[PDB]
């Protein structure tokens, strides 16, 4: 693509600059370029990839929710007809969101996941796959909605299976995967009890392993544990 002529190292350098400038669309385009060089990503590089796309899609999701709410209000009894514009613009934002998700899922399928053999990398990528199918699910209404939901579930489940076998219960990737899969259960799969059980069990297994950790690892793990607690508080 447009980044094909730029050195891998320069792309990664620029991604870091873009992050400092809060230019997340640029960050994402640089990281896509870096992935397309065909070499595996380091841990630092995986973090850059994830941050970039999280921020881009996060902004799209927030906009889509604003628009969807306006659209919903327009279809209530007593709302005066304002024409097709709200639906059209929601559709526009939705199509852009779907495109970003398809781009991320594309990078994971070609060929990040298949080349990832270490547990941390494979879990990280499979968690990402779950996440971007979950964003597709949030906006899905068609014949494929159940398959999209099941694609997220399958990715998250594979990641969970690997994480439980290969990583300690305090590992931040394991914790983050569990946090997100729990949100999937609550928000997407209509399974709040599964969501709660997962968050609680994850929190408690992590708590029991904190004693093994350095101060720096403890900080990393407890940050995500607090997110689990925050969700549990919201849900109970």
């Amino acid at each position: 693509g447009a980044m094909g002529s730029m050195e891998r190292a320069s792309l990664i350098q620029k991604a870091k600059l873009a992050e400092q400038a809060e230019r997340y669309e640029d960050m994402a385009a640089f990281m896509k370029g870096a992935v397309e060089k065909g070499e595996e990503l380091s841990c630092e590089e995986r973090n850059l990839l994830s941050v970039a796309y999280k921020n881009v899609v996060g902004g799209q999701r927030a906009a889509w929710r604003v628009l969807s709410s306006i659209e919903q209000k327009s279809n209530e009894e007593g709302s005066e007809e304002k024409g097709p514009e709200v639906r059209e613009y929601r559709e526009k934002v939705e199509t852009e969101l779907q495109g970003v998700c398809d781009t991320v899922l594309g990078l994971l399928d070609s060929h990040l996941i298949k080349e990832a053999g270490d547990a941390e990398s494979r879990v990280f990528y499979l968690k990402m796959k779950g996440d971007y199918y979950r964003y597709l699910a949030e906006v899905a209404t068609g014949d494929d909605k159940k398959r999209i939901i099941d694609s997220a579930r399958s990715a998250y489940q594979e990641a969970m299976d690997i994480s439980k076998k290969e990583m300690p219960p305090t590992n931040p990737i394991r914790l983050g995967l569990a946090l997100n899969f729990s949100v999937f259960h609550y928000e997407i799969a209509n399974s709040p009890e599964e969501a709660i059980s997962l968050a609680k069990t994850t929190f408690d297994e992590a708590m029991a392993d904190l004693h093994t950790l350095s101060e720096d690892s403890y900080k990393d793990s407890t940050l995500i544990m607090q997110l689990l607690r925050d969700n549990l508080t919201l849900w109970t």
Partner: peptide, 5 residues
């Protein structure tokens, strides 16, 4: 909206 990472 619930927390995710």
């Amino acid at each position: 909206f619930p927390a995710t990472v």
